[PDB]
Scaffold this active site. Sequence first.
Site, short mmCIF file in Angstrom:
data_model
loop_
_atom_site.label_atom_id
_atom_site.label_comp_id
_atom_site.label_asym_id
_atom_site.label_seq_id
_atom_site.Cartn_x
_atom_site.Cartn_y
_atom_site.Cartn_z
N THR A 16 11.23 27.22 76.96
CA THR A 16 11.81 26.66 78.21
C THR A 16 11.53 25.96 79.59
OG1 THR A 16 13.04 28.63 79.09
CG2 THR A 16 14.20 27.51 77.47
N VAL A 17 12.07 25.52 79.80
CA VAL A 17 11.97 24.42 81.59
C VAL A 17 12.87 24.70 82.37
CG1 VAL A 17 10.97 23.18 83.95
CG2 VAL A 17 9.95 23.15 80.88
N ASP A 124 -1.37 12.90 75.11
CA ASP A 124 0.73 13.09 74.79
C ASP A 124 1.52 12.19 75.93
OD1 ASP A 124 3.03 13.44 73.32
OD2 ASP A 124 2.95 15.15 74.83
#
Length: 266
Positions: A16-17, A124
Site C-alpha cells: 500500500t501507499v 515503467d
Amino acid sequence: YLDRKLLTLEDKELGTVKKGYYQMKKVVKTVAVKILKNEAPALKDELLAEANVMQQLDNPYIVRMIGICEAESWMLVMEMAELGPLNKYLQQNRHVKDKNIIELVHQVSMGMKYLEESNFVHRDLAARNVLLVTQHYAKISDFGLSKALRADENYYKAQTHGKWPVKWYAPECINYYKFSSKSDVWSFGVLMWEAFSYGQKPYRGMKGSEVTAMLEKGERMGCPAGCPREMYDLMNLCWTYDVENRPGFAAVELRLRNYYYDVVNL
Ligand SMILES: Cc1nn(-c2ccnc(Nc3ccc4c(cnn4C)c3)n2)cc1CN1CC(O)C1
C-alpha cells in the site's frame, strides 16, 4: 534509515501507499509512504532495490526519497506530491488545456533526459507513474523496475514478462527483452498519448499480442480528440520501430521546449 517514532501515518490508502508526516530537524514534512504488506522474503529486497535507485537520483522532476523505515513493516518514505497520478488527475480535470499538458509532459522529458544522462532505465514510464506536485509541476515516480546500466552497455537484458506492461513496451522489449533509454522514449510516446487523451488507457480493448501484431504491421494509435498535431507527430517519432533511428530524450526534450514556447507565443 529513518526513525519510526518521528513518522505518523494516515489510516487510508492513496503493498500500500499511505500519506504521512515525518518530523524533520524542526518542521514536519508531508510524505507518501510505500508500505510493504508481508504477513510472512524477496519482497523486502525489491523495496530496498527501489530505494537504492532513488537514493542515487537528484533532479527536480523526479520524486525524492526521504529514506527507508524498518518498523512493524518495511517502508519507503518519499516527499509528498499532493495531487497524485497524472492519468487520474486529467481524468477528473477535463478543463486542463493544451499548453498545461504540454508543460507537464515537457517536465517529464526533462526528468527522463536526466535519467538517460545518469544511465538508468525506468522501464515503467506511463502516465500513472507521473505525480503532480501542483497543476504545473510533474515528477516521475515508481522506480521499482528501474535498472542502473552497466558501464559497457546501453541496455539491460530482462527475463520473460507478463501481459500487464506490454502496452508501453517498445518492439525490442517485446521480442528481445532489451531495455534502454530508447525503450523509455517509446514508453514516453505512449505516456504523451495518455496525457493528451486525458488519462484514457492506450490500445483500448486489445490484448498484448494484438498490440504487438499492430506495431509489427507499421500501425500506431490514432490522434486523440483535440490533441495538438505537433504533439501527435512527436508521439509517432517516439514510436520509431528501430532503436538506432528513434530519438533519445535530449532530442525529445528539445522538440518539447520549442513547441511549448510556440504555444506560449501564439
Ligand atoms: C511509489 C509511489 N510513490 N507514490 C507517491 C510518492 C509521492 N507522492 C505521492 N502522492 C500521491 C498523492 C495522491 C495520490 C497518490 C495516489 N493516489 N492519490 C490520490 C499519490 N505518491 C505513489 C506511489 C505508487 N505509484 C503511484 C503510481 O500510480 C503507483
